[PDB]
């Protein structure tokens, strides 16, 4: 699973976009970073 090959150089450097959606779906109060910008 997750056999992505969105490797830049000969591709866009917006490797953030993917997670920026997948993480929302797999929400967890963003505790994974615990510094998202809303830790009360």
UniProtKB/Swiss-Prot annotation:
Site (Cleavage): 1-2, 7-8, 16-17, 19-20
Coiled-coil blocks: none
Mutation effect (residue 23 to N): In CAA-APP; Iowa type
Glycosylation sites: 10
Protein origin, superkingdom: Eukaryota
Outcome of mutating residue 13 to R: Only 23% zinc-induced amyloid-beta protein 28 aggregation
Phenotypic consequence of residue 22 to K: In CAA-APP; Italian type
Binding site for Cu(2+) 2: 6, 10, 13-14
Residues carrying the site annotation Implicated in free radical propagation: 33
Localization per record: Cell surface
Subunit structure: Interacts with S100A9.
Protein name: Amyloid-beta protein 40
Species the sequence originates in: Homo sapiens (Human)
Range within the parent protein: 672 to 711 of 770
């Amino acid at each position: 699973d997750a056999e992505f090959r969105h490797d830049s150089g000969y591709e866009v450097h917006h490797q953030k976009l993917v997670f920026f959606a997948e993480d929302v779906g797999s929400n967890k109060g963003a505790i994974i970073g615990l510094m998202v910008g809303g830790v009360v």
